[PDB]
């Protein structure tokens, strides 16, 4: 029961949530390597349908490495737990939770920032816009969208959507709800 306890502290899940996600992991491990690779995620039938599926899969793995174990699975999967208000109102110690609003924002950011630069250039934003917009659109319209997006977000003068500007422009969106998941018990 210890193994399901370090994960609970590091992530925040429950024991039953961790057990169910471990069952999903070992089901995803066709090949039984004790870990999980890019193609094991790619084998999921409807991730290839997702316009952002490849960025999600890459985000599951650490930079440099090409595999993930169950602890990494849970770490990158715990950003999508919802936050309960009475929990954070009870024991105020620090903003550690991997499911905090800034952490979901950072997950989507690291999707936008394929370089992990901590700043999104026009090229990175245009690349992700291409990856998630129908092919019929003219790349002129897409570049207009990208540069208008940066201009309306980069209230600084650097022509880059850096992280602090991301949170500021997303201050209106309920990140806490549209990127939260009731993981089953």
């Amino acid at each position: 029961d210890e193994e399901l306890e370090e994960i609970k502290k590091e992530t925040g899940f429950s024991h039953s949530q961790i057990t169910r996600l471990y069952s999903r992991f070992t089901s995803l491990d066709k090949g039984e390597n004790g870990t999980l690779s890019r193609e094991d995620f790619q084998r999921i039938p409807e991730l290839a349908i997702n316009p952002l599926g490849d960025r999600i899969i890459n985000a599951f793995f650490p930079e440099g490495e090409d595999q993930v174990n169950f602890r990494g699975f849970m770490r990158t999967l715990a950003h999508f737990r919802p936050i309960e208000d009475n929990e954070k109102s009870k024991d105020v110690n620090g903003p550690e939770p991997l499911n905090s609003r800034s952490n979901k924002l950072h997950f989507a950011f690291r999707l936008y920032d394929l370089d992990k630069d901590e700043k999104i250039s026009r090229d990175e934003l245009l690349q992700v816009l291409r990856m998630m917009v129908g092919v019929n659109i003219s790349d002129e319209q897409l570049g207009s969208i990208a540069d208008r997006t940066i201009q309306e977000a980069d209230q600084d003068g650097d022509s880059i959507a850096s992280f602090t500007e991301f949170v500021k422009v997303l201050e209106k969106v309920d990140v806490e709800q549209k990127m939260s998941i009731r993981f089953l018990h």
Binding site: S27, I44, I49, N50, I137, A153
Partner: protein, 540 residues
């Protein structure tokens, strides 16, 4: 007085002539209806059919031929109902239906039994208080009314509330509940009509226990008959590679035979032809040719539109009959209140229970379109006019209240569900990153594999590809399928109209009156090609 050269003989061609005139006039009204998107996006087509049935019934009343029209049980239950149910069950998206089977069952079986029992018992409790007054009526009559009155059709209002709120799980709940509660309502209808045959004193405790056992036996046996006949229908189309003309005939004859075989075994005939369409879907239309599969699906909307039209013309013929019009202030105004309040809190309670065990919660907006999606229509009305006029003493009051409720739900609720939903759910970077968030979630909900019945989908797909496809799909089709699997095994508003939509927000439609292929599945194929072209980058 001798031999007549020509004789005008209208009494001869009078039943088929009027039925064909009904269908033709409804088709012309559909020519007018679908002309402008400003109408079909606002008015549910069921409302068109009900208004048209009223107008044609007004013509019938003017001609003084009301007594010439009677809907008889052998006609509704054998010729008018099977096409509607087969059409619904044959266009059911199988993956969504079976990935949400429990939710659909809860909204369609418990939701129907809740609605039926609560409306019947609440009307009976009102009646015992004397508010209705001097009705020669019993408990079983009220339960029969409640049972037939639970035959909601929320999919009739689907094309209009999805202009403002699209959610493919709510679509399958609305579409599944519309279809599976026709079965459950007809099951309850038959049970309580058998009880009405016995009487309020002949029904004993063992009779009620057999009623409950009959509910379950009938439902499950009908489903099993449907699955057997879907196997048989999938099998027979395997052997029609040469004689391709009889394939649409097989899909309708064998589905009909499943319906009648359940009606023969006293099982749920609706569930048989429901699941003869749900289950035949994969292998039928894999063995059928492309040309013969458009016939199957043009004919299914042809048969179901005509059937629903006829029942709605009969609704108009009864809604103008001045000899069935019995208006009880309490009964009518409490049937309207009870079926609306109990539907609302039935959905609220069931959704609360389901949300305890779900990965994507059903938001209150989904519950709103379910509660406001009464839309009682053809099945509800037909089951009332088929009541025995002497076994149910107050049948005319039931027919009047059901007509009033059909009109209130379809016209008032069917027309104001789009303003209401759009009222209840009331920047470039905001929208782009919101769509990115949605696409991230539909991947995390997918990676974790807790959305569908993924374990059972995996188990079925293994069993389907290794065993079932060996007997239901042609050999050369099996070879082609395995070759394809082998070659694939190695592998502001402007912005809104440009972005990919998330898988959760595909605009699925079922009309019963027109073919509505999901036009967002084009997105799926486009992105699949883009990723496969990206999967060729590895050169594998």
């Amino acid at each position: 007085g001798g031999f007549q050269v020509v004789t005008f003989e209208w009494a001869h061609v009078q039943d088929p002539y009027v039925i064909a005139l009904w269908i033709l006039v409804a088709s012309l009204a559909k020519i007018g209806f679908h002309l402008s998107h400003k109408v079909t996006s606002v008015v549910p087509e069921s409302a068109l059919l009900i208004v048209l049935g009223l107008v044609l019934g007004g013509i019938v009343w003017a001609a003084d031929h009301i007594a010439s029209f009677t809907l008889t049980p052998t006609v509704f239950f054998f010729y008018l109902l099977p096409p509607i149910v087969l059409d619904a069950g044959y266009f059911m998206p199988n993956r969504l239906f079976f990935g949400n089977l429990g939710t659909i069952l809860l909204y369609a079986v418990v939701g129907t039994v809740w609605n039926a029992a609560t409306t019947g018992l609440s009307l009976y409790g009102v009646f015992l208080s004397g508010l209705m007054g001097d009705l020669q009526i019993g408990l079983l009559d009220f339960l029969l009314f409640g049972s037939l009155m639970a035959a909601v059709d929320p999919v009739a209002v689907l094309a209009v509330f999805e202009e403002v709120h699209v959610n493919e799980v709510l679509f399958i709940i609305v579409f599944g509940e519309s279809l599976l509660n026709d079965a459950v309502t007809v099951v309850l209808y038959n049970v309580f009509e058998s009880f009405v045959a016995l009487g309020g004193d002949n029904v004993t405790g063992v009779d009620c226990v057999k009623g409950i056992v009959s509910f379950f036996v009938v439902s499950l046996g009908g489903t099993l008959v449907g699955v057997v006949f879907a196997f048989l229908l999938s099998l027979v189309t395997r052997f029609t590679k040469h004689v391709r003309i009889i394939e649409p005939g097989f899909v309708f004859i064998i589905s009909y035979l499943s319906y009648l075989t359940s009606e023969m075994l006293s099982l749920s005939a609706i569930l048989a032809i429901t699941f003869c369409g749900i289950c035949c879907q994969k292998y039928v239309k894999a063995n059928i040719s492309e040309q013969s599969a458009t016939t199957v699906r043009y004919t299914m909307k042809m048969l179901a539109s005509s059937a629903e039209t006829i029942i709605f013309m009969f609704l108009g013929i009864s809604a103008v009959n001045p000899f069935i019009w019995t208006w009880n202030t309490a009964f009518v105004l409490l049937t309207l209140v009870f079926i609306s309040v109990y539907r609302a809190i039935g959905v609220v309670l069931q959704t609360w229970l389901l949300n305890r065990y779900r990965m994507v919660q059903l938001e209150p907006i989904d519950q709103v379109v379910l509660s406001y999606g009464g839309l009682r229509g053809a099945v509800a009305f037909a089951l009332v006019v088929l009541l025995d006029g002497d076994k149910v003493k107050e049948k005319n009051l039931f027919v009047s209240t059901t007509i009033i409720v059909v009109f209130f739900t379809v016209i008032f609720q069917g027309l104001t569900i789009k303003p209401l939903v759009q009222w209840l759910k009331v920047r470039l970077n905001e929208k782009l990153h919101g769509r990115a968030f949605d696409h991230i979630l539909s991947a995390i909900e997918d990676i974790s594999g807790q959305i569908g019945h993924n374990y059972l989908r995996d188990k079925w797909s293994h069993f389907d590809r290794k065993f079932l496809s060996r007997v239901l799909m042609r050999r050369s089709a099996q070879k082609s399928r395995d070759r394809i699997l082998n070659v694939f095994h190695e592998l502001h508003h402007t912005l809104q109209q440009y972005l990919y939509k998330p898988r959760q927000e595909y605009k699925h439609l079922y009309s019963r009156h027109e073919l509505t292929p999901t036009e967002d599945e084009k997105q799926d194929r486009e992105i699949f090609h883009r990723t496969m072209r990206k999967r060729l980058e590895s050169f594998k």
